[PDB]
Amino acid sequence: AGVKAYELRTKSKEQLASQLVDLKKELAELKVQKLSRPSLPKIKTVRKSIACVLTVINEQQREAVRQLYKGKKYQPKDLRAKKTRALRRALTKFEASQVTEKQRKKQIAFPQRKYAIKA
Amino acid sequence: AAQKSFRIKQKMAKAKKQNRPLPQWIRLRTNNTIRYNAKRRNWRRTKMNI
Amino acid sequence: AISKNLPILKNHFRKHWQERVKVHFDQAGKKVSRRNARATRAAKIAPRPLDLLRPVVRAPTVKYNRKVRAGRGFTLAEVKAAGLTAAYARTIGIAVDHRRQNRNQEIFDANVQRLKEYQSKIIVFPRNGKAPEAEQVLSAAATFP
Amino acid sequence: EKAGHQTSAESWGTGRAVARIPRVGGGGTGRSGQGAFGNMCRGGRMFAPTKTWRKWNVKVNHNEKRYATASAIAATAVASLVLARGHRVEKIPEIPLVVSTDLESIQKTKEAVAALKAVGAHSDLLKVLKSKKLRAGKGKYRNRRWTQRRGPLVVYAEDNGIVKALRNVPGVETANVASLNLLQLAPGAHLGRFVIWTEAAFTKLD
Amino acid sequence: AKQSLDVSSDRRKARKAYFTAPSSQRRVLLSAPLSKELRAQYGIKALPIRRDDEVLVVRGSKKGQEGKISSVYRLKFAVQVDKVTKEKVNGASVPINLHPSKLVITKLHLDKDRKALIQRKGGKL
RNA sequence: AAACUUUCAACAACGGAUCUCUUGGUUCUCGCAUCGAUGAAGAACGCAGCGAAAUGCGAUACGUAAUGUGAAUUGCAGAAUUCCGUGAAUCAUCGAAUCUUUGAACGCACAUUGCGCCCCUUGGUAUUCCAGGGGGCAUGCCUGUUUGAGCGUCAUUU
RNA sequence: UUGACCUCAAAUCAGGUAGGAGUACCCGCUGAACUUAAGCAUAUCAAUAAGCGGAGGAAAAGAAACCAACCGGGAUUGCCUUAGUAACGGCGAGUGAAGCGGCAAAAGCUCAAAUUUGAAAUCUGGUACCUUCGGUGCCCGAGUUGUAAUUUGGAGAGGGCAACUUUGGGGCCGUUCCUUGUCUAUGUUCCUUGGAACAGGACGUCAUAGAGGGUGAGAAUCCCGUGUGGCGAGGAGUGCGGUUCUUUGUAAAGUGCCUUCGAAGAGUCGAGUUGUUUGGGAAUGCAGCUCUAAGUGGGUGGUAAAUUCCAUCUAAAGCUAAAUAUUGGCGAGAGACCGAUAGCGAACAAGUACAGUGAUGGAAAGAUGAAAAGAACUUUGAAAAGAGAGUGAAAAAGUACGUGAAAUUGUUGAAAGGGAAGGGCAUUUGAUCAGAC
RNA sequence: GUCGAAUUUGGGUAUAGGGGCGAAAGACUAAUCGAACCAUCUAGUAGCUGGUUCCUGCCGAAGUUUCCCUCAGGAUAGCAG
RNA sequence: CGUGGAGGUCAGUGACGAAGCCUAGACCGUAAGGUCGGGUCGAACGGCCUCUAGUGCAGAUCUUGGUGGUAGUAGCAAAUAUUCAAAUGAGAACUUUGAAGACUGAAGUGGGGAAAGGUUCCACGUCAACAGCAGUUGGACGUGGGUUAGUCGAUCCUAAGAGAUGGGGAAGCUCCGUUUCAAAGGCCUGAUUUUAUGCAGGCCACCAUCGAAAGGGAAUCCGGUUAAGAUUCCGGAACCUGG
RNA sequence: CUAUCUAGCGAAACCACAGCCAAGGGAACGGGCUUGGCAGAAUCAGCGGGGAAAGAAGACCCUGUUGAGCUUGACUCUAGU
Incomplete structure (x- = not known):
């Protein structure tokens, strides 16, 4: 079982914060009562539930700053594209499509004419 | 030695955790071939060289 | 070393010649790959014959001045x-x-x-016209031997 | 190219009462002190390592391939030779066996099979079905697992669905008169294979 | 004969794919044919078996014994059936593994997705 | 004559040859172009209810989120509602994340788990002292900015 | 006094970028020796291994300061061929190209040197907005020691005459490619053996499906797949086939005749000497020094020099696919390959266990059975174990496990033996035995 | 033998292979020294030593000529198939 | 003649037993070898015509593995030495306890450490293997427990030395060089209490850093306590540094 | 204190096959071959005549177109100067 992530999305940051410190308490008595009893596989569910709460929390503040930095240059480096070091350094398509007028005139005037040969 | 760096005592703790025989239930696994622990080390037979 | 009545031979194998040895075991593999790229381009440029009209040019080097052969280009004149x-x-x-x-x-x-002859037998299509299909042939060198 | 040479072994020389073969150095592992680099040593390189420059394909005169294909074609009309290859042609009316061109335009395998039986290929087909055996040697697990005889060779002048009609029939091969493989016309260098000519196929030979 | 260039006739790879197949793909591998009664009733010949069907045994020494599937032991490439067991000498009962290709389904365990799988393959319910 | 020695057979030993297998190797062909300061490769230490290793992962630790499939996982125990399901799985997929300590490795160091400084905040009656949390503080170099140095130098003064 | 310019600094100033890894294949740089010469030193290995720097999906090269001497060819690359040739060479050992011809692939080109001077028109960056691989408004700066426009030798530019011809971008649906999902036939009928039928026999069915794998033994028809097709889903963009909106532009390109011009690269070319390098010979390239030009000039034209001609290109500046290479990475298909001392060192928790201070060195090791059904229970023993009982088709399969050789060993049986044994011819004796009837 | 010093010794540190260090023995430089060890070139070359795997049938030698930095080797004629 | 593999054919053999292995049983061939019978075994394998090669072993002080005679043999003799009884156990020369007899003899066979090792420390259970006899015992085996600091060390300084930087070589990995042909750095006090520290000032010229658990160096003592830790815990009584 | 005998534990070197002599001949010094002498199971403690006993592909000598350390008015070079 555990927690449902799709239920965590609805609650605000203040409700998740209480739940995270609530789950932190619960896992603490599971550890205390594990040392007496032979086996306790329930600690697994609480550990994963804490991780799910933490992950859903993280995306809420991460999107909060994407919208804060929405519609401008200079995004934070951890929110940019992780394509590839070489590809990220690669020239854009606008900067690779720049053409001189001397060739721009020739492209306009003289493109490769589509010709067939039957007669 | 008694006085030692944290690297040495940390790496000895690693070698003390690993010093015990095979878990018994592992040989009960489906398609199991591991018959014992072939990396067991004792302080009197071979030295760690750390 | 030297021995019974035999011609002298110059066999150049005293380097580490064993690593620079090519045996194209691909002869058939390259052939099929050529025939896909030969057709894959032919689809992309569809009407055109995959090659340029090349001229007729009399060879150099009096050994071969006696035959004529395809040239590279059409000599702006x-x-x-x-x-x-x-x-x-x-x-x-x-x-x-x-x-x-x-x-x-x-x-x-x-x-x-x-x-x-090339101008008569070709059909140039307008940049904005209907551009009707014209049943390409794949070689100008074949059409004009 | 390096198998059996991926070590640093050297000979110990004389005076040590052991053979002068190069031996693995170092110590403490049981591999050390053992022979290396020899075609006798365990773990060495085998004698004269195979290299690939070997001569795999053999060039055969064009005229001979044409000579031999005509011989294996002329040998298809000898019932003595075809029987020697064990083609079960005792009940065939006469050879060469030529059928009407309508065989060339058959789509379904079941139709093509019944066509062969009525022509006289019943006995030959069943021989392939019952001859399926395992390969004897290590070829089972080199993708050569099963073995069977080879049945009739059907040759067409045109392909309107016949190559795919007998595509799933064991022992049966389909051929074109232009190609006329010699490997098909005399399997195992044994002349006299059973061949069914279509009417159009037989005409095109001239 | 196979015609694809993306299909291998390699015995080594075919053996390795089966033995290292993940559990999700093993579900398709452990498919059981349907009975004559169900085949005419549904229009499906075989389906991926699951835990709640009851099958019939048509091969092996357990021929003619009916029982509802008890577990689909995907690790062992096996299916266990209740009431088909071998009693040990020390009064203990152990299930005997059955391969689904030797089993015949007598009524499917109908769920929403199993029903939806039926129309997907052309079944007539 | 026994014992003993030698030879052979049967049975039993020692040993692991042969025979038959093969999720391995090897070679050839085909197709593709994709690591790293937005921190690579590598290393250390850790993480499972019961694991030493391999394999997986990083204090969110044999994994979280998302998508698909659709009932398992399994050596034992446990959990069942999650079973006509916004849903099992050591499932596939993977576009969101976490990613301890290091490492080109970057505050200064390093055979030390050593030693500072700046910014915001909290506590100890505290800008100064001590402690906690969060963010920082390498070098070469390019373009731009700002504060400057030089009787190097122009013009203007009084 | 104040404000500039030049030059040089500083900042945890704004934005970035190099490093390191991998490195089979490429571009350089450095550079051996083992060896061959029946010694050996020039020579050869070898312009190689090792060492260092630097990239990509290919790299590099590449549109002649080329090849040729023809009735001229026309970027580069690669194949076949030239050719084991011209040539080099203790003229010994040995080495060793290219032009020419056919094929794969083919694609071209652009900068410097020119006043827009009737107008810095140009470019970075900063800030606001917007339809963001970006556009527009505004503001410092770069920039007169030259940023935009115009042209590249094959040309071209400034004027005169005559007239013509030709044009851009944004949305939508398909197509192409890639990844991926799903659906699409036919026996488990009868008899026998067997633990198991997947075997044998009879009867059928499908086949654009009789490739392969699995299931208790050789399974087209039991399962997955296979074959042929159908239907979806997510991505790349103009490669193109249609639909539509904007008219770009009082712009640009091509074209005939006359006239005036036509700038074309320097510590560079080139020369001597040294060294190395080459197949390159009175010097193939390269680099070191010293000298160091030119404009009907200069480079090349494979015997040095002086004189006279002739041919062909345009260096000291630059970009560019494909044809080519590939034991590295990723993903596949295969084999007259190997089968556990073989095949990679490694089929397994193998670069592991282990050895050395270290750099490094580096194994062994696969197989019960269809299924653990892995032997309940009784009995002897301190226990390990034994003897029964049992499971299993088989314990002549008991986790020392398929089969289970030899050396070597025990037990039983037979025989011989005064310092070897073993062997050959021949026969007696004992044991055993085939044929023939 | 020497035993208060040209004494003994620990830890740190410096010196690296045609190199160190040497009250000098070619000594020592990790049981390795008249040139350490490790990997690679490297399957380094050997006119020299050793080995070189099934049967039957038929034929059947030479140690001699000349040249060679030639004398444990080759080339050459001869003998053999 | 034989072997691994490949094309052809015998609609070849086979779970009613393929291959392998063993057999002073039979048959064929001059031989290489071939064939059969019996036992064991459990899944594949041959005849013939051809093709192909990593194709035949007695030796190479051959390679790897395995095994003998030697042989129940050499041996298990340095370091003065054991004995009696009880307990435990299946079992005692060797374990425990008691008694007796001895030794190390304070530059010890005692009590602590440095380097090194890494859990060997301690408890419980336990003897298949190891302690070259034995074993109930063990530094073995299985399972666990155990190391508590302001004052003891490290942490700081510097030594011989190592080593960035600014630069200078070197094709280059890198070498020189540590104050050198550097614009090389930071502390006190003010001034405003829009207040951050701009601004009043003066002073300073050395100069990265690493390098000693035996050098230099701020400060803790006693008593008690555990199966196993203590100048560290507990009780008491102190001192030092910083604020 | 060993050796010796016993309980326990328990190797190695070496090994073509082996182990009685005389003479002969023979690779010129036999355990084996020839002619003779002889010849009786199984063995224990010693012993050092023999097994040309074992330990090492003679370190002396020689040969090889095999080296290396060192020397010098050797040959051919070279750093430095």
Whole structure:
């Protein structure tokens, strides 16, 4: 079982914060009562539930700053594209499509004419 | 030695955790071939060289 | 070393020749790969014949001056003689040589009539027209031997 | 190219009462002190390592391939030779066996099979079905697992669905008169294979 | 004969794919044919078996014994059936593994997705 | 004559040959172009209810989120509602994340788990002292900015 | 006094970028020796291994300061061929190209040197907005020691005459490619053996499906797949086939005749000497020094020099696919390959266990059975174990496990034996035995 | 033998292979020294030593000529198939 | 003649037993070898015509593995030495306890450490293997427990030395060089209490850093306590540094 | 204190096959071959005549177109100067 992530999305940051410190308490008595009893596989569910709460929390503040930095240059480096070091350094398509007028005139005037040969 | 760096005592703790025989239930696994622990080390037979 | 009545032989195998040995075990593999790229381009350029009209050119080196053979380009005098501009002819499957110069009229007029025959038998389509399908052939060198 | 040479072994020389073969150095592992680099040593390189420059394909005169294909074609019309290859042609009316061109335009395998039986290929087909055996040697697990005889060779002048009609029939091969494989016309260098000619196929030979 | 260039006739790879197949793909591997009664009733010949069907045994020494599937032991490439067991000498009962290709389904365990799988393959319910 | 020695057979030993297998190797062909300061490769230490290793992962630790499939996982125990399901799985997929300590490795160091400084905040009656949490503080170099140095130098003064 | 310019600094100033890894294949740089010469030193290995720097999906090269001497060819690359040739060479050992011809692939080109001077028109960056691989408004700066426009030798530019011809971008649906999902036939009928039928026999069915794998033994028809097709889903963009909106532009390109011009690269070319390098010979390239030009000039034209001609290109500046290479990475298909001392060192928790201070060195090791059904229970023993009982088709399969050789060993049986044994011809004796009837 | 010093010794540190260090023995430089060890070139070359795997049938030698930095080797004629 | 593999054919053999292995049983061939019978075994394998090669072993002080005679043999003799009884156990020369007899003899066979090792420390259970006899015992085996600091060390300084930087070589990995042909750095006090520290000032010229658990160096003592830790815990009584 | 005998534990070197002599001949010094002498199971403690006993592909000598350390008015070079 555990927690449902799709239920965590609805609650605000203040409700998740209480739940995270609530789950932190619960896992603490599971550890205390594990040392007496032979086996306790329930600690697994609480550990994963804490991780799910933490992950859903993280995306809420991460999107909060994407919208804060929405519609401008200079995004934070951890929110940019992780394509590839070489590809990220690669020239854009606008900067690779720049053409001189001397060739721009020739492209306009003289493109490769589509010709067939039957007669 | 008694006085030692944290690297040495940390790496000895690693070698003390690993010093015990095979878990018994592992040989009960489906398609199991591991018959014992072939990396067991004792302080009197071979030295760690750390 | 030297021995019974045998010719002298010069066998050049005293380097580490064993690593620079090619045995194209791909002869059949490369052939099929050539025949896909030969057709894959033919689809992308669909109407065109995959090659440029090449001229008829008399070979150098008196050993071979006696035969004639395909050249590289059409010797700007030729493209201007047949009434066409080089910047446009390069868009019509004509190979033009900016650095070859005509020196023989019988060779000269052969390229002119070659290029005149080419103009009649080709169909150039408008940049904005319907561009009807015209049942491409895949070689100008075949169509004009 | 390096198998059996991926070590640093050297000979110990004389005076040590052991053979002068190069031996693995170092100590403490049981591999050390053992022979290396020899075609006798365990773990060495085998004698004269195979290299690939070997001569795999053999060039055969064009005229001979044409000579031999005509011989294996002329040998298809000898019932003595075809019987020697064990083609079960005792009940065939006469050879060469030529059928109407309508065989060339058959789509379904079941139709093509019944066509062969009525022509006289019943006995030959069943021989392939019952001859399926395992390969004897290590070839089972080199993708050569099963073995069977080879049945009739059907040859067409045109392909309107016949190559795919007998595509799933064991022992049966389909061929074109232009190609006329010699490997098909005399399997195992044994002349006289059973062949069914279509009417169009037989005409095109001239 | 196979015609694809993306299909291998390699015995080594075919053996390795089966033995290292993940559990999700083993579900398709452990498919059981349907009975004559169900085949005419549904229009499906075989389906991926699951835990709640009851099958019939048509091969092996357990021929003619009916029982509802008890577990689909995907690790062992096996299916266990209740009431088909071997009693040990020390009064203990152990299930005997059955391969689904030797089993015949007598009524499917109908769920929403199993029903939806039926129309997907052309079944007539 | 026994014992003993030698030879052979049967049975039993020692040993692991042969025979038959093969999720391995090897070679050839085909197709593709994709690591790293937005921190690579590598290393250390850790993480499972019961694991030493391999394999997986990083204090969110044999994994979280998302998508698909659709009932398992399994050596034992346990959990069942999650079973006509916004849903099992050591499932596939993977576009969101976490990613301890290091490492080109970057505050200064390093055979030390050593030693500072700046910014915001909290506590100890505290800008100064001590402690906690969060963010920082390498070098070469390019373009731009700002504060400057030089009787190097122009013009203007009084 | 104040404000500039030049030059040089500083900042945890704004934005970035190099490093390191991998490195089979490429571009350089450095550079051996083992060896061959029946010694050996020039020579050869070898312009190689090792060492260092630097990239990509290919790299590099590449549109002649080329090849040729022809009735001239026309970027580069690669194949076949030239050719084991011209040539080099203790003229010994040995080495060793290219032009020419056919094929694969083919694609071209652009900068410097020119006043827009009737107008810095140009470019970075900063800030606001917007339809963001970006556009527009505004503001410092770069920039007169030259940023935009115009042209590249094949040309071209400034004027005169005559007239013509030709044009851009944004949305939508398909197509192409890639990844991926799903659906699409036919026996488990009868008899026998067997633990198991997947075997044998009879009867059928499908086949554009009789490739392969699995299931208790050789399974087209039991399962997955296979074959042929159908239907979806997510991505790349103009490669193109149609639909539509904007008219770009009082712009640009091509074209005939006359006239005036036509700038074309320097510590560079080139020369001597040294060294190395080459197949390159009175010097193939390269580099070191010293000298160091030119404009009907200069480079090349494979015997040095002086004189006279002739041919062909345009260096000291630059970009560019494909044809080519590939034991590295990723993903596949295969084999007259190997089968556990073989095949990679490694089929397994193998670069592991282990050895050395270290750099490094580096194994062994696969197989019960269809299924653990892995032997309940009784009995002897301190226990390990034994003897029964049992499971299993088989314990002549008991986790020392398929089969289970030899050396070597025990037990039983037979025989011989005064310092070897073993062997050959021949026969007696004992044991055993085939044929023939 | 020497035993208060040209004494003994620990830890740190410096010196690296045609190199160190040497009250000098070619000594020592990790049981390795008249040139350490490790990997690679490297399957380094050997006119020299050793080995070189099934049967039957038929034929059947030479140690001699000349040249060679030639004398434990080759080339050459001869003998053999 | 034989072997691994490949094309052809015998609609070849086979779970009613393929291959392998063993057999002073039979048959064929001059031989290489071939064939059969019996036992064991459990899944594949041959005849013939051809093709192909990593194709035949007695030796190479051959390679790897395995095994003998030697042989129940050499041996298990340095370091003065054991004995009696009880307990435990299946079992005692060797374990425990008691008694007796001895030794190390304070530059010890005692009590602590440095380097090194890494859990060997301690408890419980336990003897298949190891302690070259034995074993109930063990530094073995299985399972666990155990190391508590302001004052003891490290942490700081510097030594011989190592080593960035600014630079200078070197094709280059890198070498020189540590104050050198550097614009090389930071502390006190003010001034405003829009207040951050701009601004009043003066002073300073050395100069990265690493390098000693035996050098230099701020400060803790006693008593008690555990199966196993203590100048560290507990009780008491102190001192030092910083604020 | 060993050796010796016993309980326990328990190797190695070496090994073509082996182990009685005389003479002969023979690779010129036999355990084996020939002619003779002889010849009786199984063995224990010693012993050092023999097994040309074992330990090492003679370190002396020689040969090889095999080296290396060192020397010098050797040959051919070279750093430095």
